[PDB]
Amino acid sequence: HMESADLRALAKHLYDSYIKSFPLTKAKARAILTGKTTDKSPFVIYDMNSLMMGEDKIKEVAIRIFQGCQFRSVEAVQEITEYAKSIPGFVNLDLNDQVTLLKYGVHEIIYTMLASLMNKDGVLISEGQGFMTREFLKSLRKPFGDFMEPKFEFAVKFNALELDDSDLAIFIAVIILSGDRPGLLNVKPIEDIQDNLLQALELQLKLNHPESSQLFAKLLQKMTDLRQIVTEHVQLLQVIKKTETDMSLHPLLQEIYKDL
Amino acid sequence: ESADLRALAKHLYDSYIKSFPLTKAKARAILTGKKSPFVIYDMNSLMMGEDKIKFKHITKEVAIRIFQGCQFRSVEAVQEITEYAKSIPGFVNLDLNDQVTLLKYGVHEIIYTMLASLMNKDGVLISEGQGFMTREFLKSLRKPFGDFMEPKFEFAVKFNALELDDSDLAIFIAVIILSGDRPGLLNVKPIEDIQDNLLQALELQLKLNHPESSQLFAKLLQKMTDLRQIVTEHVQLLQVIKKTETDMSLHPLLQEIYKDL
Ligand SMILES: O=C(O)c1ccc(-c2nn(C(=O)c3c(Cl)cccc3C(F)(F)F)c3ccc(Cl)cc23)c(OCc2ncccn2)c1
């Protein structure tokens, strides 16, 4: 049990690092999506021709879009790794466990943070300069169309929680410091860190969302929807791999899936 | 208010005790050796136990008969969980289709959960604590059945490290039943309203019953992740067994009884 002032200190530290680590925050994404402004309005990609035009403004189309997603995913792994290093105690853990926590945590975090860029109608891309519609992604051929849509399905549900970045900074940290990842050597020091982060998340959610009953429990229950979609995702990639030779994953993603 | 949450907690404990034949408290006294159960550790001792104790489940090839014995007992537990659900305040007031949907999609998670109460690292109680079948004998069953039994123990051992007691579990079980994300629910709001009450009661219960166990509430909810994961694994294991095994036909009425499991 930490002292209340120490838990507030931890929350601010983590929000501050989250802001330094991730260039496109939820607050910026929501300002772009909600609009009103003339200076931050995205170009909208909703069909083939607008895609071609989008490349002038900002191999097969579905493959090109798929490769756009892994390029950003790789970048996200880099951003998530930098953030993890800022979590108090993380760089002090056994070095193999650091790799293990990142290996199994980044995908859950990418999905979580992907939701910040989504509404029910599409997703922000190219650092907010673009917006690709959900219907266009869903209409891609072969396996790729159905590969796009489950992310939207989770995001619509996660976004009903109305978390802001200061909440998400702690949530993300909790996910990374999971003592139940396969193959961890020293679970106790990981769980001790998570206990503090969980205490910090609990107090953060009560102060920032006082009228939102049991949001702490409901957010932890979302770590369940995350676990399942990551497993679905992996089994979709494998199917794509056994079909498509016109693609190859970045060595960073390359290694992460090796263990699944 | 705290006294209302304690009331709800005691209400659920009382009902939990009437609904389930073997409580975790009684099961642990048997497992720790604190009237010895009959021990099934190999083929010959299995033969004697059914001739001496006459287990109604295990009664074809031996690995198949044990597997079907687990399916028989699961069918019994479904009825026990269903009766318990009726005691959860607000449950019988839900739309009847939603009551059936919540039970349909929750019984598997609850059965794994309560199975842990009857398990330790060395085996599992059966027949209301009268028998004990070793983990090694179950794990050593041939073909797919051996690998079907062992994941249950692996989950149980990790879940049991939480050291929940029956008063804790009665509320936990109720939380699982009142999941508003089950497919096909017609009216989600009253289910989530009830789950919110039960979570408050579970949170308070764990702080009072386990004051030294930091963040036990969060860790128990995180186990809903392991529960969802193993139940879906469970499903893919049954499908393989069904599509593979031709020595599995029971009387068609028996097949009807077991459908869904
Ligand atoms: O900015 C960000 O933070 C971001 C994070 C993720 C994606 C994104 N990955 N993705 C995957 O499939 C994927 C995930 Cl989740 C994790 C690991 C590996 C992969 C992959 F290797 F398999 F690629 C998506 C599938 C559908 C959608 Cl709509 C988005 C993603 C992202 O794309 C934005 C985007 N939409 C369309 C066109 C271009 N760009 C941005």
Ligand SMILES: O=C(O)c1ccc(-c2nn(C(=O)c3c(Cl)cccc3C(F)(F)F)c3ccc(Cl)cc23)c(OCc2ncccn2)c1
């Ligand atoms: O008393 C009780 O409360 C009880 C609750 C569960 C089992 C049990 N189910 N089971 C399953 O597979 C299963 C689960 Cl988890 C959930 C839903 C459906 C099923 C099923 F339909 F597929 F059966 C097991 C697998 C392995 C083991 Cl060791 C036990 C179980 C139980 O068996 C006791 C037992 N051990 C050995 C031999 C005979 N009998 C007792």
